[PDB]
Amino acid sequence: AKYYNEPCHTFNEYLLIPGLSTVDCIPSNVNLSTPLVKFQKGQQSEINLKIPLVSAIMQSVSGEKMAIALAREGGISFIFGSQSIESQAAMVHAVKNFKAGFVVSHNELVDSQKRYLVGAGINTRDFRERVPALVEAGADVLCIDSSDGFSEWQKITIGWIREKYGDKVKVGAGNIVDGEGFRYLADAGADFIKIGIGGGSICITREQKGIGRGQATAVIDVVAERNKYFEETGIYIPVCSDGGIVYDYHMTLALAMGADFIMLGRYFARFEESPTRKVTINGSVMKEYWGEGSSRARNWEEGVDSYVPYAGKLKDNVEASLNKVKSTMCNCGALTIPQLQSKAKITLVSSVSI
Amino acid sequence: AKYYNEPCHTFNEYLLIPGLSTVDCIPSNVNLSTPLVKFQKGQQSEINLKIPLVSAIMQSVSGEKMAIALAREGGISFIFGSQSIESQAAMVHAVKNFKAGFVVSHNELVDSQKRYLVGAGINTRDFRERVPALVEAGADVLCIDSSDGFSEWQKITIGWIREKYGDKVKVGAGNIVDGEGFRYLADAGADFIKIGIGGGSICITREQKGIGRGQATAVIDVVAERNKYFEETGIYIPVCSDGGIVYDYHMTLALAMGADFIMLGRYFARFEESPTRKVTINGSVMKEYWGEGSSRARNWEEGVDSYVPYAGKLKDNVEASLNKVKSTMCNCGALTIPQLQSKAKITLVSSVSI
Amino acid sequence: AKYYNEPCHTFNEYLLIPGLSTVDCIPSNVNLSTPLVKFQKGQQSEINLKIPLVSAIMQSVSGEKMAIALAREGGISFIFGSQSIESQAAMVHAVKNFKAGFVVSHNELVDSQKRYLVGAGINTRDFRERVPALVEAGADVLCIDSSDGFSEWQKITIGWIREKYGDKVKVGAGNIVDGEGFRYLADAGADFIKIGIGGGSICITREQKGIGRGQATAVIDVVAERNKYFEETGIYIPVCSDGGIVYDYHMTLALAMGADFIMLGRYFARFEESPTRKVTINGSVMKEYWGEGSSRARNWEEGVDSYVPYAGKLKDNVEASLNKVKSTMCNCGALTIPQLQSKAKITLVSSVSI
Amino acid sequence: AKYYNEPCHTFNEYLLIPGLSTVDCIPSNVNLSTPLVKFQKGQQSEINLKIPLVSAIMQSVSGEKMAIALAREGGISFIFGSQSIESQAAMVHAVKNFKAGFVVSHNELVDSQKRYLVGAGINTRDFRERVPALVEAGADVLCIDSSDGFSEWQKITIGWIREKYGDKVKVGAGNIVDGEGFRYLADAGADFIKIGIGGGSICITREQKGIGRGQATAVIDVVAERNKYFEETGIYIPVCSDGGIVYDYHMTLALAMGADFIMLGRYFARFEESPTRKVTINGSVMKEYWGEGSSRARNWEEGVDSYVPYAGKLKDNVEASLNKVKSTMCNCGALTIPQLQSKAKITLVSSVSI
Ligand SMILES: COc1c(C)c2c(c(O)c1C/C=C(\C)CCC(=O)O)C(=O)OC2
Ligand SMILES: COc1c(C)c2c(c(O)c1C/C=C(\C)CCC(=O)O)C(=O)OC2
Ligand SMILES: COc1c(C)c2c(c(O)c1C/C=C(\C)CCC(=O)O)C(=O)OC2
Ligand SMILES: COc1c(C)c2c(c(O)c1C/C=C(\C)CCC(=O)O)C(=O)OC2
Ligand SMILES: O=c1[nH]cnc2c1ncn2[C@@H]1O[C@H](COP(=O)(O)O)[C@@H](O)[C@H]1O
Ligand SMILES: O=c1[nH]cnc2c1ncn2[C@@H]1O[C@H](COP(=O)(O)O)[C@@H](O)[C@H]1O
Ligand SMILES: O=c1[nH]cnc2c1ncn2[C@@H]1O[C@H](COP(=O)(O)O)[C@@H](O)[C@H]1O
Ligand SMILES: O=c1[nH]cnc2c1ncn2[C@@H]1O[C@H](COP(=O)(O)O)[C@@H](O)[C@H]1O
Ligand SMILES: [K+]
Ligand SMILES: [K+]
Ligand SMILES: [K+]
Ligand SMILES: [K+]
Secondary structure (H helix, E strand, O other): OEEOOOOEOOHHHEEEOOOOEOOOOOHHHOEOOEEOOOEEOOOOOOOEEOOOEEEOOOOOOOOHHHHHHHHHOOOEEEEOOOOOHHHHHHHHHHHHOOOOOOOOOOOOOEOOOOOEOOEEEEOOOOHHHHHHHHHHHOOOEEEEOOOOOOEHHHHHHHHHHHHHHHHHOOEEEEEEOOHHHHHHHHHHOOOOEEEOOOOOHHHHHOOOOOEOOOHHHHHHHHHHHHHHHHHHHOEEOOEEEEOOOOOHHHHHHHHHOOOOEEEEOHHHHOEOOOOOOEEEEOOEEEEEEEOOOOOOOOOOOOOOEEEEEOOEOHHHHHHHHHHHHHHHHHHOOOOEHHHHHHHOEEEEEOOOOO | OEEOOOOEOOHHHEEEOOOOEOOOOOHHHOEOOEEOOOEEOOOOOOOEEOOOEEEOOOOOOOOHHHHHHHHHOOOEEEEOOOOOHHHHHHHHHHHHOOOOOOOOOOOOOEOOOOOEOOEEEEOOOOHHHHHHHHHHHOOOEEEEOOOOOOEHHHHHHHHHHHHHHHHHOOEEEEEEOOHHHHHHHHHHOOOOEEEOOOOOHHHHHOOOOOEOOOHHHHHHHHHHHHHHHHHHHOEEOOEEEEOOOOOHHHHHHHHHOOOOEEEEOHHHHOEOOOOOOEEEEOOEEEEEEEOOOOOOOOOOOOOOEEEEEOOEOHHHHHHHHHHHHHHHHHHOOOOEHHHHHHHOEEEEEOOOOO | OEEOOOOEOOHHHEEEOOOOEOOOOOHHHOEOOEEOOOEEOOOOOOOEEOOOEEEOOOOOOOOHHHHHHHHHOOOEEEEOOOOOHHHHHHHHHHHHOOOOOOOOOOOOOEOOOOOEOOEEEEOOOOHHHHHHHHHHHOOOEEEEOOOOOOEHHHHHHHHHHHHHHHHHOOEEEEEEOOHHHHHHHHHHOOOOEEEOOOOOHHHHHOOOOOEOOOHHHHHHHHHHHHHHHHHHHOEEOOEEEEOOOOOHHHHHHHHHOOOOEEEEOHHHHOEOOOOOOEEEEOOEEEEEEEOOOOOOOOOOOOOOEEEEEOOEOHHHHHHHHHHHHHHHHHHOOOOEHHHHHHHOEEEEEOOOOO | OEEOOOOEOOHHHEEEOOOOEOOOOOHHHOEOOEEOOOEEOOOOOOOEEOOOEEEOOOOOOOOHHHHHHHHHOOOEEEEOOOOOHHHHHHHHHHHHOOOOOOOOOOOOOEOOOOOEOOEEEEOOOOHHHHHHHHHHHOOOEEEEOOOOOOEHHHHHHHHHHHHHHHHHOOEEEEEEOOHHHHHHHHHHOOOOEEEOOOOOHHHHHOOOOOEOOOHHHHHHHHHHHHHHHHHHHOEEOOEEEEOOOOOHHHHHHHHHOOOOEEEEOHHHHOEOOOOOOEEEEOOEEEEEEEOOOOOOOOOOOOOOEEEEEOOEOHHHHHHHHHHHHHHHHHHOOOOEHHHHHHHOEEEEEOOOOO
8 A cells, every 4th residue: 555754634724924015916906817728838728717716516506597696706607417418408508698688489707709608517427418418508618527536437538528529628527636646637638627535515514435635735736746747748737626615715725725726615505696495594594505425416325415604695705705815815925826826835734723 | 662753543544545446446346355364475365255344252242143144244253252162162053053954952154065154262261172162163263362462372372273283273363553463473373363452442431551552553564564474484464453443434444554354343233133132222222332351241450331323234234334345445446455455545634634 | 835844833832841940040030121123243222121021002902001001010012003193192192201290281111211111003004194293202112013014015114214214213013924024024124023923812713814823933933034134144133922922931932932022912901001991791800802903993804802801900910920931931040031042942742732 | 942853742642562471471470669769780779669659749648647558558658848847757757656566755668677668858948957857757768849850959959968968868859851950960969850840630720830841751851861871870860750640551651661660649649548638529529639839738829729539548549550550561571660661662642543
């Protein structure tokens, strides 16, 4: 067996040490643009998010309304794939054609036709039928959804997409937690790679499957491999820190450690736009939230079902969260995510102080 | 005094990092066969379990019914030796002759005569009389039961067995927690060595005797010594991780760290087949469970007596546990235990994340 | 990104190991004098506190009465700047002219005219108007108050002061937590540098902003840079450990680690002289205490409002605290703060023992 | 300031790993004799305890009855010195002349006249008068009682004793927690050195004074210095682990780490023979226990007053404790304390497993 020198850590175990803040760095001047899909050295990504936040590929998070609301603020949602091909394609189509008027019976993220961008999750099983349907519906990007992306099944899925669509259809893959996993999916052709196993808030109320790694350590390790890969091939593959974001400052940390964007479930589940029921229990307005591994999810094993405090509209909450991220970025002397990734000073905190 | 560079750790402090999962690895194709007794390089063990689980040498765990139920699923039970020679021999005989019809007044683990295999615990005191009786009764393997197997008494016991039966009678020894202890029992002639002191769940409700070591560290250290021993002598001695299994994923970890099989007490005590009373307390069906060191056990000092939640039939529970182990093995890219031991990537987790 | 070899620690994680105590070291012979502003090798600071304690630049701590009471015991207060220029200048003037008799409508810290010394906090925004007013009022020293002093805004503020007053007006700067930050403010011209971000007791009831560092690690790191700076330039810049003092022995630790003086908020908020209301809740006399980042403070975001147990007069409490500090200093073989900083033996304690 | 590479640890953070147990090692054959005062290489100590336990120099622990009861079992008590010279001398005399019949108005520890041995605590202040009185009363050994023995006052006290009595009067000194402190008292002439600051159970209900060190680390460090000192001078100075013994196995650990004997307060306070009142609170028989630093103690600052569960007669409790120590010693392959100190394998345990 192979062992490691240091134990893995979570975001709660880190803090940022300030760098030189210039008179020109104020929250409003901070640019949160970030690449979504791979590109070559010197190029720009074909798809750039205006804010580094994407909603989780979950039934209780990314429905049509969430996708529209998030795209309006500059991010993108990945419509859940744990539903019928027809049902998921309908949501994608609804998002792509939302601005239409008569239909035959500032930071918005849109395509060349001013239509909101939207992503869609796929699986390694029915892709031969699901992918064409999502492509037809107008999906802007796809992502293989899995608890263990270090699999030949993902390579096969990406291969089929490349053979049928070449590099015209974008597809992310995951999840992985180390350089080996990243490298495998990179060579397989993934446009972006998702990082994270066992770090989601859903795991708080469930038992360990035995596989996983502290989210912070996973991002740091994968990012190092991604940078090495860039140096060897000239190909820059964006990576996504998926899960484990508990507080707003965790967002800044994930980005500082090298993640290009962040995927969140619980964070968005709390909003009015999530596709779940708003329930009031003893004066407390809550929203439903369950894992994709729960029996409640897959039936169209693991299992986690819970409630999250209602937070209102997505817009006001994201604005507040990102204002804090931008302010912290200025503390670190960064006006952009790439500058933050270059200048960030990250310290581990003692367990005693926690 | 001799000190160590790193502190010892328990199973809860580890997680497995996924490896490449091939299209051919599905739970049903995973082989959990494993050697029980020592053999030379290139040989196969004379006794191979079909599943890597054996029940503890305890009054509250391994009785006749447990032995039959576990053997039926591919494992083996070690009938407790903390009872009269006559009483223990009777249980062994009952297991060996269970399939008999008229008696004169798929994954089953059996001998050449299709009789379920069964083991029996012995002590370093009355072995001259207990061993012959167990051999006559048909015991397939014996194991010296002790909290500290690094003892001349164990060497003497194994020696007497070798002098009387040669290598025709198999006998495990233990418990030890480091290379020195392993080496001593290996040179003494033990067929398999049990690892673990102070890691049993029984210790949760009792005070430390002062001796012990984190179960994970103990297995890792002993396994390293065992592999070194194999390289020097060509003799492969199976080792058993005894105690400390709290969750199913701990089983996968123990195996990944090098243990050939696992001994459990609490896990099996919960089943209908354990020899203890099923008691209902306030709507909760429980089963009794007490340590062999408790005054309640030895009287035919330490002391631990408690209850464990009823889990029903052994069969359904083991199937569920092993299905999870096999699934995790596929995440790690392993179709067998030896392949897992070779490919496993094991990371320590921070105390903060725990 | 830049990472660190060791995690940061708080004061609770340290203890002092005794050194040789001489017959001449008794609490009463211990000298707690300490420099407040920078000086060259071989010189004495133009301003020396008689005790190493200064009260925080907070609305709920440093008002006129606090400033008089603390100066009487040998320390100095920094009148809060989160109020109108006119209001703050009035408090400064009131302190400077407290001993006056007819006014036209042993360890005391005083100026050449026997007037109590007093400091005043300033900000990087209205200094062009606030500074002249404070200077006119008689402020003896100023200090830029900020959660992140590693800023060009602080350099600009110090620059303006130097251009207008040369080295005749003393001004501290902060806060910083590492050598880089210290170095920046040192080169900018600061007379003393304050250390500490996120370590204040106020943070106990609030969420992390994402920036910070264990107070002990921050002091140790900054002190090392300060000593290096002294060796390179011959300039000795006093540093202040700001926040995180929970127990009296933390004072001794901060000083032993190299801090010349200590800034405290909660400690002084408990006294009769703090400018907040004394409220009795269920038989418990308390005093109000809120952070400068709370909405309650700035309105003339973050937010922390709470109560601290009443402790009575500042005099008796400081005497008791310092008697303990002096006794511990004698345990360490030190009769002065500089001797303590040279002889102190500081050990980290295990999280288990905590 | 001077810092250390590793944090200090307590006894709870350690466990012993078994060594080879020989057929000749059974509890009854284990010899717990141990030296009390210094001797040269090749010699035997002039005073050897029959068991390695001594009672604390406390008002609530070591009175006349305790001294007699402990001496009867082979240990020695140090009559508290926090009382009048006349009062303390009376207790010493009472112990020395307990076996007398008409008075003019197996493992027992005795002198050449069959009189129970007894020690007495002294202070660095009134020794010129207290020492002669204790010597006259028949005290067999003295010990300077202090929270910080790294003091010129202790050197002066030992010096006065040597000048007046030469090496005919034995006197221990302490407390210290590192090699420097040990070395100072060794060169000063101490017959034995006590280790421990802040590790006593009394500290559980009180605030840190700021000085101290984990008890285990303190013993290990001092023992290393003591062994180095022995190699350089040929003088063997016994050391005493004072305080921090919570469980019986802590005794074995302290001895294994190199301490020759152990001083305990709480342990003995629970017995019928302690000089405090036996009080029954709600069906629970308790005994009083307070620190020597409490105002309740010195008045003939710190302060700790509490209750300990009644345990009955000293005899039965010590026998049980030592039976466990001896059994563990056999697990480690040791028949004597020196053999244990040579063969012991000591591992640190993870904070997670604790
Ligand atoms: C696929 O969605 C996830 C993801 C992305 C992760 C985890 C997880 O449990 C599930 C649900 C698990 C499901 C639906 C079972 C199928 C599978 O195994 O893919 C996790 O632990 O890390 C990441
Ligand atoms: C023998 O069964 C065990 C085993 C295997 C272990 C422990 C233990 O306490 C007992 C009971 C202890 C008994 C019956 C006393 C006799 C003895 O000492 O063997 C333990 O701590 O690690 C392993
Ligand atoms: C300025 O007073 C402080 C200081 C000294 C510190 C912190 C802090 O939050 C505030 C209040 C924050 C305010 C008033 C907002 C403006 C600003 O950012 O300066 C902290 O975390 O470390 C040190
Ligand atoms: C002297 O008895 C002790 C000892 C041995 C220790 C401590 C302690 O507090 C006291 C009481 C402290 C007193 C009576 C005040 C005088 C003094 O300082 O000696 C401790 O922390 O480690 C060891
Ligand atoms: O059932 C589940 N168990 C564990 N993780 C899950 C499950 N369902 C989704 N996830 C992961 O958890 C992420 C959300 O983490 P969260 O933002 O902390 O709530 C998702 O994007 C997935 O990667
Ligand atoms: O009384 C006891 N004290 C400590 N360990 C015990 C005792 N009795 C049995 N054991 C050990 O605990 C193991 C069971 O651990 P468990 O599976 O965690 O319950 C047994 O196989 C023994 O090795
Ligand atoms: O609102 C706030 N949030 C965090 N820190 C604050 C705030 N206001 C003041 N502080 C810091 O906390 C210090 C006081 O720490 P305290 O002595 O532990 O209460 C001040 O001197 C500031 O440096
Ligand atoms: O007031 C006190 N404070 C701290 N330690 C004390 C005090 N009085 C005695 N001690 C120490 O505590 C030891 C007893 O530790 P205990 O056996 O854990 O109760 C004594 O022998 C002293 O060294
Ligand atoms: K900054
Ligand atoms: K895999
Ligand atoms: K000292
Ligand atoms: K042994």
